[PDB]
RNA sequence: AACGCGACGAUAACCCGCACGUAGACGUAUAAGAAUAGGCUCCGGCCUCGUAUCCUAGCAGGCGAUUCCUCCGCCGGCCUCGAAGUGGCCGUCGGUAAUUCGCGUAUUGCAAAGACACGCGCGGGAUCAAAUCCUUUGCAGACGACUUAGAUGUG
RNA sequence: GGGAUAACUGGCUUGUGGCGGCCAAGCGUUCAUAGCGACGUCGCUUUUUGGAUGUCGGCUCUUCCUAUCAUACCGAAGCAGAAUUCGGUAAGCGUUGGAUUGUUCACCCACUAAUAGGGAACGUGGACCGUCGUGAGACAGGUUAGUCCCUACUGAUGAACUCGUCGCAAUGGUAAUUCAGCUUAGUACGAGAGGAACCGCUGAUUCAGAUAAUUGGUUUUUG
RNA sequence: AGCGAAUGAACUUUAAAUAUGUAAGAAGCCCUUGUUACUUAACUGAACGUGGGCAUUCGAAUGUAUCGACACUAGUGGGCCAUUUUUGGUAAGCAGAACUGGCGAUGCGGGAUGAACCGAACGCGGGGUUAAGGUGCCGGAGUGGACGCUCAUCAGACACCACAAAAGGCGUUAGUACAUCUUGACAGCAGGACGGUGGCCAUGGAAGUCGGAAUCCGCUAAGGACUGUGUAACAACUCACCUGCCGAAUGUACUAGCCCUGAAAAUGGAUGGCGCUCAAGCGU
RNA sequence: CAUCGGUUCUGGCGGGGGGAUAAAGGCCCAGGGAAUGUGGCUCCUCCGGGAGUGUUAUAGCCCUGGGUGUAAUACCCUCGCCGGGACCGAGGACCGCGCUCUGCAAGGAUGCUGGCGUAAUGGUCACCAGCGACCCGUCUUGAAACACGGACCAAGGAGUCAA
């Protein structure tokens, strides 16, 4: 139908800084650094109150307008990651071989390695490499859990996501067999 | 165009109600208005409505409405010009939020000293602040989660700790029966599922639900009342700050 | 790649005689990168636009002045350029309308065989440095082809 | 005996029957009734006690397709384990016999990881006539019908670019397969009978490329 | 067309289009008067003779590179394809007539190429202008202009059907018909989702939720003798429905474009190639 | 090269006519109306910006009738004038039709200037380049496709003569 404007907001709290210098946006706050790239979507971006981004689109079509609300909760996204956090509390459940996990963070490209010994008594030990950004450290308050931290939402949701995929069960019932490790808690470290 | 969703058509008697209901509703308001003396009317701000049925089967004599406030409001009439009686467009100012109408024949001091004198525990819906810290313990979960004593308490069905778990409790089962930790005891800390002074969003809401902890009050608050002889209305209490339109 | 390319080793300077001087020059001038729902910048401002910027006067461009330290070129010296390799700076020397003049240009008529100097090659001989044939070799061989060896030696 | 088509297919072929009835959105002679009519369902085949194949082959080899038998990977199934079953991506790599037969398939039996199916103008190594017959038949009756060139590629050479040494790599080909044993482990799983897998370790078949110390074979060294 | 004309394609005052037979003067017309070998009741017909008018509009249009009679002389006496009409038939092909046209004895421009398509017919040359077809490059000529549509895991490409369906498409655009909507639309969240009634039969059990039948009523704002999960039965969760919060357009079925799928084998290959994506595709 | 003739291509200019004597439009005159509501006024998270009311105020718009007005312009048709380029020069005393008449553009190119003999201009061969382009005869057939003949050259070689 090419639709001549189409705006969105995007509020902006009061302990941020962002900036967009094409489309590559850096929000900078209590939490850290985060920075992304939007050049693939043509968005104009522009100041419209004291602490609202202005996204906008002019002369578009259907997708082009659902384009600008896809990249609203990105940015929104990096805007809760770098104020609040996100976390993710898996937990590894058993039968009858005790699944062992061991976090140590590497000295060279800073990043958390989780690796997993004894999965229905497998004699593999299984390393995942966690995305430079995030932190995992094991649960004290409760057994057998384990904690996901960070500023990246799609950091912590990958690492945690490449944990339960390593850990899938083959060539046997999955009816009987319930061994492996599942995200169960999922929201913010504030 | 296409890239829709399917809505699903539900093959079950009850359909929607429509136009007709809403002409019925104003007929029976309309049809006793004339037939009783007083016009009450009474706000349930955040409460289950589940015991005003209790409330209809003491009160027989009386008749009272509560449905779509502006439907309530329009059959009252809202203007001066368009009203059913006279002081019955000052209760349309008056319904704003969660309001009924109370139509009653018997002496008003009698209505608000019962409803002065009601009081039911409930339990607390979404958005009002904890009263007390509640707390399973980190042992094997019972019904109740610890708020009777354990030795005549019942342990909780296993159907259950599919939306225990859904809800946020790190719950397991062992040989059966479900267990927060340890089958014995200890190994784990436990589930505080309600703080002091925090608001009560919608999970633990469900968790007090299922496991019959009652944290809330049921009270319903008398606004005020319109009399067909004296014509005027008079603000009982609860209308004095109430924000009203 | 037997009509793809590179690095390296060693070569062919003499003397005698003789055959000829553009698959398209004519100012054949111009290096940022990057974005294109942005960018450049003297940090003043600027961007549709290469319709731009350098160079361009002089017998096919003479001779001598007045006058000028600007531009061009050659050698060095020191450094830089390697994807299929060049420019910078300094010094010498040669040239040089930024200003103003003087003496030539013609009757080739309105457009369409002289002398000197320098290269590219041919035909002889003499001086190099190699290769092939030759003899041996057998790590090789249908035949060619290939691996060796033969000038004084560890043959 | 006369007449007529020179000849077949070339967006052909494959997995789901036919007949009648009921229902039926639409279109139509003027409208869902002049009527055409799918998907389903009903009646028949079809129900209440568990052999088929004519000419052909047979073997090797090349190459291709996938409509995949095995090997790799996943999705689903009361899939406990083990063994499977159905489906999907997949042609990289491999792909039998025996009994019986005119010959094949079906079935049965054995081996193996399995011993799938196809394509390559369906790959490369009589024809009358005459004679005698006529209820049918023939003929020691006849004559006649009826195909050594060029070039691609590969290997070894090769003129010219001065000879020789050390290189670069455009392009073309391309390679590895399958099974077993030890440990995991008599462990997960299981009432029992039974019974895995990952990591690690060691062999074997096929295939490819080399080599002659040793062990066989061979003797124009005629010792 | 009408049947406010009659009557009822077989109705008609009238009348198509469209092909297709026959006439449109002087070599012609009419009648008068006579004969005959023909015929008739009879110049009633046929023939032979008689009379007239108009020859400076002699009886529509257009064209007219002459026509006719006689005699003589060569070569020929096959068909193939297409349009339209028409007879028969098949599951579909197909077979046979009639007219016309093309090719046969025909060169040229175009469709990349070509018996049957499109344009156009021919002495030797110079100049100009077109047709069919084209103007991104191969290739002469537009990376021409205007408004849209389309992204295809081998799109489509300019003058054409079958597979193919009442087919599948959470692709995209335009439109039609119904319905809801500030009396707060659809979507969401917070809640209610009751009571007779663990309704009647069956029965270890069966309370809405393994089955058979019935499927009623009070409160209502609404709530099914129940949409699913569940239990040995319970319980609990859920859906239908209803209320509060937000706030403006929705959502069902069809239709028409373009696009995907709508079946494929086997040497390596084809809109002619390159390649093309606000086209170098498609419609005007 | 100048002045001409024939054909042709391509630029620019001056008029005339017609349509609703274009429709519009500018400036006036008169009546009417509205909001995508000007100023004002009220509410109004005050460099600023929204909501409502109300018909021209400190902006303007629409509709109708009239004047300037026989307005201009577009479009269609038409009478002419001037420039730029290409190809061509047939014929050979006069005659004809004319005209702007001491001769002209009127039944077909003259005038002026230059160049050309150790080469103006041609020929043949070889080769390169762009575009084009099946091997002839015979025979069959609607046609192609088959089929027969062709190693090459010279000489001979086939509708004749009588009644």
Redesign the interface.
């Given at each position: 139908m090419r639709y001549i404007h189409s705006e969105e907001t995007i509020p902006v709290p009061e302990n941020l800084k962002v900036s967009i210098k094409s489309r590559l946006v850096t929000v900078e706050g209590p939490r850290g650094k985060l920075q992304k790239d939007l050049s693939h979507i043509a968005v104009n971006f522009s100041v419209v109150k004291k602490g609202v981004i202005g996204l906008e689109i002019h002369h578009g079509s259907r997708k082009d307008v659902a384009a600008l609300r896809t990249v609203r909760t990105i940015i929104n996204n990096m805007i809760i990651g770098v104020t609040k956090g996100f976390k993710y509390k898996m937990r590894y459940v058993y039968a009858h071989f005790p699944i062992n996990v061991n976090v140590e963070k590497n000295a060279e490209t800073g990043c958390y390695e989780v690796e997993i010994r004894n999965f229905i008594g497998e004699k593999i030990v299984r390393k995942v490499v966690m995305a430079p950004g995030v932190e995992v450290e094991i649960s004290k308050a409760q057994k057998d859990e384990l904690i996901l931290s960070g500023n990246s939402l799609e950091a912590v949701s990958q690492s945690a996501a490449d944990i339960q995929q390593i850990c899938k069960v083959r060539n046997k019932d999955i009816r009987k067999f319930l061994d492996g490790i599942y995200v169960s808690e999922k929201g913010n470290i504030v | 165009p296409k890239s829709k969703r399917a809505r699903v058509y539900h093959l079950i008697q009850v359909n929607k109600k429509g136009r007709e209901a809403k002409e019925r509703l104003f007929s029976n308001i309309r049809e006793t208005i004339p037939k009783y003396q007083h016009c009450f009317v009474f706000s349930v701000d955040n409460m289950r409505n589940n015991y005003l049925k209790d409330v209809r089967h003491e009160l027989n004599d009386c008749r009272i409405f509560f449905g779509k406030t502006k439907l309530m409001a329009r059959a009252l009439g809202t203007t001066p010009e368009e009203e059913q009686a006279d002081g019955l467009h000052r209760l349309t100012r008056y319904l704003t939020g969660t309001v009924g109408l109370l139509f009653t024949n018997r002496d008003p001091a009698d209505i608000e000293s019962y409803f002065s004198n009601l009081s039911q525990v409930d339990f607390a819906r979404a958005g009002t602040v904890a009263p007390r810290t509640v707390t399973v313990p980190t042992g094997i979960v019972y019904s109740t989660g610890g708020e009777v004593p354990p030795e005549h308490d019942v342990p909780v069905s296993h159907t259950l700790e599919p939306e225990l778990?859904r809800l946020?409790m790190?719950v397991?089962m062992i040989k059966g029966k479900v267990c927060l930790?340890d089958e014995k005891g200890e190994?784990?800390?436990g589930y505080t599922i309600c703080k002091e002074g925090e608001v009560l969003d919608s999970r633990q809401t469900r968790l007090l639900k299922l496991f019959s902890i009652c944290l809330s009050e049921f009270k319903v608050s008398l606004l005020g009342y319109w009399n067909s002889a004296s014509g005027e209305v008079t603000e009982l209490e609860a209308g004095k700050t109430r924000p009203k339109r």
């Open positions: - | 778990r946020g790190p397991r930790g190994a784990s800390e």
